[PDB]
Enzyme design. Structure first.
Site, PDB file in Angstrom:
ATOM      1  N   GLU E  60     -36.796   8.257  14.284  1.00 36.53           N
ATOM      2  CA  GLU E  60     -35.379   7.943  14.431  1.00 36.53           C
ATOM      3  C   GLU E  60     -34.799   8.516  15.723  1.00 36.53           C
ATOM      4  O   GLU E  60     -33.830   7.971  16.261  1.00 36.53           O
ATOM      5  CB  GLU E  60     -34.617   8.457  13.211  1.00 36.53           C
ATOM      6  CG  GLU E  60     -33.173   8.034  13.125  1.00 36.53           C
ATOM      7  CD  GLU E  60     -32.302   9.103  12.528  1.00 36.53           C
ATOM      8  OE1 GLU E  60     -32.845  10.010  11.886  1.00 36.53           O
ATOM      9  OE2 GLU E  60     -31.076   9.056  12.704  1.00 36.53           O
ATOM     10  N   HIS E  61     -35.385   9.594  16.249  1.00 34.93           N
ATOM     11  CA  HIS E  61     -34.949  10.128  17.537  1.00 34.93           C
ATOM     12  C   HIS E  61     -35.286   9.190  18.686  1.00 34.93           C
ATOM     13  O   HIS E  61     -34.477   9.009  19.598  1.00 34.93           O
ATOM     14  CB  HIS E  61     -35.580  11.493  17.799  1.00 34.93           C
ATOM     15  CG  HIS E  61     -34.915  12.631  17.089  1.00 34.93           C
ATOM     16  ND1 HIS E  61     -33.690  13.127  17.469  1.00 34.93           N
ATOM     17  CD2 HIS E  61     -35.326  13.401  16.058  1.00 34.93           C
ATOM     18  CE1 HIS E  61     -33.362  14.137  16.688  1.00 34.93           C
ATOM     19  NE2 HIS E  61     -34.337  14.323  15.822  1.00 34.93           N
ATOM     20  N   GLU E 137     -32.570  22.134  16.899  1.00 38.04           N
ATOM     21  CA  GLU E 137     -31.626  21.763  15.854  1.00 38.04           C
ATOM     22  C   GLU E 137     -32.114  22.163  14.473  1.00 38.04           C
ATOM     23  O   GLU E 137     -31.330  22.131  13.521  1.00 38.04           O
ATOM     24  CB  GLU E 137     -31.328  20.268  15.898  1.00 38.04           C
ATOM     25  CG  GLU E 137     -32.483  19.395  15.522  1.00 38.04           C
ATOM     26  CD  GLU E 137     -32.281  17.967  15.952  1.00 38.04           C
ATOM     27  OE1 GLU E 137     -31.167  17.635  16.398  1.00 38.04           O
ATOM     28  OE2 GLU E 137     -33.239  17.178  15.851  1.00 38.04           O
TER      29      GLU E 137
END
Lengths: 106, 57, 51, 54, 446, 418, 49
Positions: E60-61, E137
């Site tokens: 998804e990144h 993150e």
């Protein structure tokens, strides 16, 4: 609700005031009430000049009964000068309890 | 004419009755989490974390 | 008074009653084994009470 | 003090022979012990509230 | 003048079609100048084993960073030049990518979405730059206490199964995910029967179908590799996780029993239930007067900062429970009052509480369908859970049947003498013992 | 259909209803009130008014407001800004007539009782500390204090010396002078027109006039510095631009989107941001820059906004100030204006999708202008902005007297004269 | 990181057919919460001393 012989119920209300003797200790009628949980909430809602007037009137009367003494008959609380300072604040605390109770019956 | 929230970055704060009070129109300076390490504020007076995403029906 | 009656406490009394009865029949049949009530040991004859 | 002066009357009657006067006094004063606590006391506390304007 | 009954007969229906690739195409049209369009996929972290738990979040990144026809930031320039937004998300069950735009760049927008999910580059120079953005993150995620405590509840309630692992994966997998293991994730979980092309706003279903035929025809609607994996279900466990850290100012606690899955009809009475407990936060305006009992108590005694109930469904199982935040000397009273409210609904549940809990549930589902973006996600994932989009008339005729006897019966089935799963994050020395927790699950009177 | 009905009553009250056929409804009341209208003696009265919505009013007690609204699943909420306040209620369609009589008691006949206001004073400290866990919240209150002498420098939150001291007599005076008929707008979204009219004739009885207005805002070019222990430096640098509802105001809106005013792609490099690309040439450390733009009834502030590490806060503000200088001396391409007109038109239409974004916009237009314009009128005005107006807006910024506000470790932040 | 922890192995302590990791503990629910428990049901007969 009498309108002709209302002369009679006024003499009996005066007589019971002086047969009772909280005025001889210089107290007002709302000082002598028994504090249940409604009365302890109405005391918390008073303006501060009225609260301080009540704490001193009570302390002077507990001290007068430690020595079996009475104030002279010039500092006795009069009948037509007793201010019902707590009765407006207490009728609203009771009315808010009877509303949270009719809502729990729904 | 148009609003603060359209073309401007002042604040609005919100207070609810059943949901959690918030306050912002510009506030989120995004594109600052792809450059690393901006950490979520530690609370001593807890506030919304999802701002009522629960109870979706 | 008017503190006590309504559509609330008596429907809390609705699921009370089975509780009351099995709090009452607990007190009824439980009293008879401690104080040697010989007038109720007769009613169920299967339990040999005293030898 | 009507309740105290009735437990005195029930102490004098309680050591008398069961005869004619000592039973009309023994039962009219065993009634008055229960009529004062259960009935006459809660009604007189209400008349007092009504004369103090609550 | 209209009615709430009449207005439910006026929501335009969801037209579903299907290509020969098996792709379902759904829509709703209500005359608006903006339209949402995305794809909803049946992939997630519950379809991963312990070799590639990070792989679904890594993909998804890289999705907005270069395609075969729009390389690098040329995709960024084209979305920005027409005023369009480009969002995504990812859970344990689903994976989305979508677009907000104007309802005249829909031919360009659908071509953008079809190019994203088919021909991503996943080049070697971008994934090494993407490894550092994920590793940092993860460190920002440790400071969010609600994310860490809800990750504890899934690792303890579903311990031995794929429903324990989290979406991001362990940091040792984030560090070592290859290029080869990213493309072999795309082949197995981005197939045409698993995707749903949804749309809301001003859109024609007939135009969306030809755009789907023009762009999505090169997908293989076939069973290549012969990998149809047997879906094996996941079991619940009563157990506990306690993380003690006295330097944190407040403590987070979450507790849950097993719940029903997605298709189970028990979910509607179990949401009248959790709406009777409710939620609270210290910034609320009318505490000590609130209808909830746990919320009216916790405001008057300052027991907590906030609490919330949840209902987290899956295909075959679920989680049903609560989460709260408090200081170190208040944990034992918060657990006492919460557990005594679950047990007062297994018995004793009133016909007045259920009516308010039914009003709360209808208001929560029409407020969640405001705007083209939440309607488009209620279209795209209802077709992957229920197989159809349940309308708002079928939801309301199931809410009308629930009464206090059904609520008492369904709460006793899921709560009355079950072993919960508990999670806690410090300062938690006053969190009670698990024996004293498990014994709080039975009544004393009834 | 029936796109909006629009009535102005004889006492200057604006009613506007749209009849959708949605199962849920929404009702708003929008008032000209806000931090702007308080002087130096009663600071923080508007923050306390915002928190006092579910207290005892003359027609429903504090028990019946909380219980009567939670019974049907409703909501009650207040949103305010420096220039307005907004009360908003919502439920399902058949429940809308009871949540509408509660709303007219909260805002049109409240009773501020002593022991409830006194118990509420501790909520001011809770709400301010919740809002100030974001560094953007206090840097922007400081910036309005560094830019004005009065009337727009007042914060939205109450000052710390003043908590515990806001009296019931001050709350009675704010509402009696600012919650009047000719400053209000009643907007409904699932209601008919003649029933919203018959609701509004239940506060005509007084407060039918204009109310205490706000002193004009005088520009002060100041500078407020705030050393603390946060990790990053938040800094803002503005100048005075243009009021809302003017021809120059649309050009600052277009110039905002040329420079770069937020994201479009999740985890993107902001490729069409001229501010972001100019900073990121020499700066390789984590940062964020944007264009700030605020607009009010008689003034507005335009400038930049940076977030950076403390040893780099001088390089970031200097790079983000040379780029605005390049535009004012003529370097402005033609396709960059056209790509920026799209983001300003598209973002206006996505802002009006929801039922709260629509009701927001109709409430602002009824207070500011007194009319409603369709989103086709608004889209034309954006396309009439020329390239000779984007340049004459970056000229007013470069030659204007500045203002500043900063926070963090300020050992390398420049001063506003440097 | 918090995503680096797993609950450790409990296979040496489970009930015999709750080593079954691939079911949903349904057919294996309310059918194994009592073997050290009906101990206490016939203790009710034994505490009568």
């Amino acid at each position: 609700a009498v309108a002709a012989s209302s002369k009679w119920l006024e003499g009996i209300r005066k007589w019971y005031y002086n047969a009772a003797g909280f005025n001889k200790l210089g107290l007002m009628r709302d000082d002598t009430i028994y504090e249940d949980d409604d009365v302890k909430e109405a005391i918390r809602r008073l303006p501060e000049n009225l609260y301080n007037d009540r704490v001193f009137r009570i302390k002077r009367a507990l001290d007068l009964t430690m020595r079996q003494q009475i104030l002279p008959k010039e500092q006795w609380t009069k009948y037509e000068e007793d201010k019902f300072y707590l009765e407006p604040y207490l009728k609203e605390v009771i009315r808010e309890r009877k509303e949270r109770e009719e809502w729990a019956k729904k | 004419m148009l609003s603060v929230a359209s073309r401007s970055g002042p604040f609005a704060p919100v207070l609810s009755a059943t949901s959690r009070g918030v306050a912002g129109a510009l506030r989120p300076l995004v594109q600052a989490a792809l450059p690393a390490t901006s950490e979520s504020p530690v609370l001593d007076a807890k506030r919304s974390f999802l701002c009522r995403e629960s109870l979706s029906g | 008074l008017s503190r006590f009656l309504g559509p609330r406490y008596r429907e809390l009394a609705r699921n009370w009653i089975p509780t009351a009865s099995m709090w009452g029949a607990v007190g009824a049949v439980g009293l008879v084994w401690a104080t040697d009530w010989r007038l109720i040991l007769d009613w169920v004859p299967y339990i040999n009470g005293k030898f | 003090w009507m309740l105290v002066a009735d437990l005195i009357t029930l102490t004098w009657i309680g050591g008398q022979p069961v005869e004619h006067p000592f039973i009309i006094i023994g039962q009219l004063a065993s009634i008055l012990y229960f009529l004062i606590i259960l009935v006459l006391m809660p009604i007189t506390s209400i008349i007092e509230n009504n004369l103090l304007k609550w | 003048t209209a009615t709430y009954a009449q207005a439910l007969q006026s929501v335009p229906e969801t037209q579903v079609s299907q290509l020969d690739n098996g792709l379902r195409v759904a829509s709703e049209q209500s005359s608006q100048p903006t339209c949402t369009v995305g794809v909803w996929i049946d992939a997630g972290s519950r379809y991963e084993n312990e070799k590639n738990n990070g792989a679904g979040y890594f993909v998804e990144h890289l999705a907005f960073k270069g395609t075969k026809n729009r390389p690098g930031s040329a995709l960024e320039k084209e979305v920005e030049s027409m005023g369009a937004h480009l969002n995504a998300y990812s859970t344990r069950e689903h994976t989305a990518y979508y677009i907000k735009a104007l309802s005249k760049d829909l031919p360009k927008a659908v071509e953008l979405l079809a190019d994203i999910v088919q021909n991503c580059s996943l080049e070697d120079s971008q994934i090494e730059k993407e490894r550092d953005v994920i590793l940092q993150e993860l460190q920002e995620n440790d400071s969010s206490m609600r994310d860490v405590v809800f990750d504890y509840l899934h690792a303890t309630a579903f311990q031995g199964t794929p429903l324990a692992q989290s979406v991001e994966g362990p940091s040792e997998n984030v560090r070592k995910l290859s290029r080869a293991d990213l493309t072999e994730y795309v082949s197995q979980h981005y197939k045409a029967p698993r995707m749903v092309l949804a749309a809301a706003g001003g859109v024609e279903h007939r135009q969306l179908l030809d755009l789907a035929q023009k762009h999505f025809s090169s997908l293989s609607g076939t069973y290549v590799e012969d990998a149809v994996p047997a879906f094996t279900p996941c079991r619940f466990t009563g157990s506990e996780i306690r993380h003690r850290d006295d330097a944190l100012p407040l403590a987070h606690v979450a507790i849950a029993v097993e719940g029903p899955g997605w298709a189970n009809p028990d979910n509607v009475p179990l949401q009248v239930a959790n709406a009777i407990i409710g939620h609270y936060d210290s910034t609320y305006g009318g505490g000590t007067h609130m209808s909830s009992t746990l919320a009216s108590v916790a405001a008057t005694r300052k027991l907590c900062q906030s609490f919330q109930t949840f209902n987290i469904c899956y295909a075959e199982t679920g989680l049903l429970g609560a989460h709260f935040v408090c200081d170190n000397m208040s944990i034992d009273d918060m657990m006492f009052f919460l557990q005594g409210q679950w047990m007062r609904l297994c018995t004793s549940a009133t016909e007045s509480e259920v009516v308010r809990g039914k009003n709360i549930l209808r208001n929560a589902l029409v407020s969640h369908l405001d705007g083209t973006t939440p309607v488009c996600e209620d279209i795209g994932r209802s077709l992957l859970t229920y197989g159809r989009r349940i309308p708002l008339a079928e939801w309301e005729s199931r809410i009308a049947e629930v009464d206090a006897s059904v609520v008492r019966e369904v709460c006793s089935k899921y709560f009355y003498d079950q072993c919960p799963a508990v999670a806690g994050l410090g300062p938690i020395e006053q969190l009670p013992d698990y024996n004293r927790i498990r014994s709080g699950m039975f009544w004393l009177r009834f | 259909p029936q796109d909006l009905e629009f009535t102005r009553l004889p006492n200057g009250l604006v009613i506007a209803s749209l009849e959708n056929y949605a199962p849920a409804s929404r009702i708003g009341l929008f008032i000209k009130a806000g931090s702007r209208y308080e002087d130096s003696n009663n600071l923080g009265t508007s923050h306390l008014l915002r928190l006092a919505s579910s207290l005892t009013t003359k027609g429903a007690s504090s028990f019946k407001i909380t219980r009567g609204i939670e019974a049907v699943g409703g909501k009650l909420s207040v949103t305010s800004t420096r220039e307005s306040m907004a009360y908003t209620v919502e439920c399902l369609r058949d429940d809308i007539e009871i949540l509408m009589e509660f709303l007219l008691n909260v805002t049109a006949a409240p009773e501020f009782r002593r022991w409830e206001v006194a118990a509420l004073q501790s909520q001011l400290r809770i709400d301010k500390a919740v809002a100030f866990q974001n560094p953007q919240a206090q840097v922007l209150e400081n910036l309005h204090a560094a830019a004005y002498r009065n009337a727009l420098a007042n914060s939205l939150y109450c000052p710390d010396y003043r908590i515990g001291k806001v009296t019931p007599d001050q709350l009675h005076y704010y509402v009696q002078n600012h919650f009047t008929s000719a400053r209000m707008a009643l907007i409904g979204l699932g209601v008919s027109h003649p029933v919203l009219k018959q609701v509004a004739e239940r506060f005509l009885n007084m407060r039918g006039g204009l109310g205490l207005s706000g002193a004009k805002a005088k520009y002060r070019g100041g500078e407020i510095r705030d050393q603390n222990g946060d990790s990053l430096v938040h800094a803002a640098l503005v100048a005075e631009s243009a009021a809302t509802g003017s021809a120059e105001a649309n050009a600052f809106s277009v110039l905002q989107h040329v420079l770069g005013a937020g994201p479009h792609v999740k985890r993107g490099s902001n490729a069409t941001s001229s501010l972001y690309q100019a900073v990121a040439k020499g700066v390789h450390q984590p940062f964020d820059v944007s264009a700030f733009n605020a607009s009010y009834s008689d003034s507005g502030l335009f400038g930049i906004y940076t977030i950076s590490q403390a040893a780099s806060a001088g390089d970031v503000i200097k790079s983000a100030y040379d780029q605005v200088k390049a535009i004012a001396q003529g370097n402005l391409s033609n396709t960059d204006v056209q790509a920026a007109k799209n983001k300003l038109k598209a973002g206006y239409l996505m802002s009006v999708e929801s039922s709260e974004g629509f009701l927001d916009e109709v409430g602002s237009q009824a207070l500011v202008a007194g009319s409603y314009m369709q989103p086709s009128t608004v889209l034309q005005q954006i396309d009439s902005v020329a390239d000779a107006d984007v340049i004459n807006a970056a000229k007013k910024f470069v030659s204007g007297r500045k203002s500043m506000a900063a926070s963090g470790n300020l050992g390398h932040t420049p001063f506003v004269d440097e | 990181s918090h995503t680096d922890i797993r609950v450790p192995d409990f296979s040496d302590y489970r009930r015999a057919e709750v080593l079954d990791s691939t079911k949903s503990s349904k057919e294996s629910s309310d059918a194994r919460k009592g073997f050290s428990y009906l101990i206490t049901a016939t203790t009710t007969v034994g505490v009568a001393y």
